[PDB]
């Protein structure tokens, strides 16, 4: 069955970005997906999107800018401490200049850099570059 809707959304975004498309339809929607796309938007990676608000779980159509190489989820959502965030960013990210571990902390869903700034740890969600 459908488990982990964030994985489906990120895979659909990756597959249609690799194909050269301009817009992606991802269904279902969730708060986690919207937060991930908001973080990924603030770094100028994806563009802007609409949440089609049907009375079910919504849909999202997201515009695509050709700036994305790989957006991905980490399943399971491992616990990450600040002492162990360096190993994760060494494992997943192509370079020290760019790429993003997204993680959920009690201060919200953010990047690894904002997690270092706010001195928080949490559970890993993804990475994009």
């Amino acid at each position: 069955v459908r488990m982990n809707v964030l994985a489906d959304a990120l895979k659909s975004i990756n597959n249609a970005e690799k194909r050269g498309k301009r817009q992606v339809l991802i269904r279902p929607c969730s708060k986690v997906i919207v937060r991930f796309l908001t973080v990924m938007m603030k770094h100028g990676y994806i563009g802007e999107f609409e949440i089609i608000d049907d009375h079910r779980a919504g849909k999202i159509v997201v515009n695509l800018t050709g700036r994305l190489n790989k957006c991905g989820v980490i399943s399971p959502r491992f616990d990450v401490q600040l002492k162990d965030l360096e190993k994760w960013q060494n494992n997943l990210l192509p370079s020290r200049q760019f790429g993003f571990i997204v993680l959920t902390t009690s201060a919200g869903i953010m990047d690894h850099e904002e997690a270092r700034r706010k001195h928080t740890g949490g559970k890993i969600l993804g990475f994009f570059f």
Binding site: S75, P76, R77, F78
Partner: protein, 141 residues
């Protein structure tokens, strides 16, 4: 594929040890049937008594007679065949002689032309075969 849940630790480690038993070197090291079939009994070297001298015929593409020796080890009574390396070095060996033997290099596997020899003679009558061959020392009897 593989299980990747946050609660799959015992499944992963149990499957790891079960498939670890399918590794040949792991099963040689840990089952304990190769260690009791090994004549040295987990020793680098063993010391035995020369029973007889043997000409072992080399395997098919090479034509030679390799000078080996049937030795009985002192500590367990097992019988092995040990190769005497250099030329004329079998003449330094007599029957019923005290001989230090080591493995030959491939960890219990036969080496090169010689069929079924895992061992080589290191010392004869408590003097090395190297010093006898190079003529540095003399052998008692």
């Amino acid at each position: 594929g593989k299980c990747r849940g946050l609660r799959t630790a015992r499944k992963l480690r149990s499957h790891r040890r079960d498939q670890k038993w399918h590794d040949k070197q792991y099963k040689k090291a840990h089952l304990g049937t190769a260690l009791k079939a090994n004549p040295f009994g987990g020793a680098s070297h063993a010391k035995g008594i020369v029973l007889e001298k043997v000409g072992v015929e080399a395997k098919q593409p090479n034509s030679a007679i390799r000078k080996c020796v049937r030795v009985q080890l002192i500590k367990n009574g097992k019988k092995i065949t040990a190769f005497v390396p250099n030329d004329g070095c079998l003449n330094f060996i007599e029957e019923n002689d005290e001989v230090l033997v080591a493995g030959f290099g491939r960890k219990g596997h036969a080496v090169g032309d010689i069929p079924g020899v895992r061992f080589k003679v290191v010392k004869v009558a408590n003097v090395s075969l190297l010093a006898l061959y190079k003529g540095k020392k003399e052998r008692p009897r």
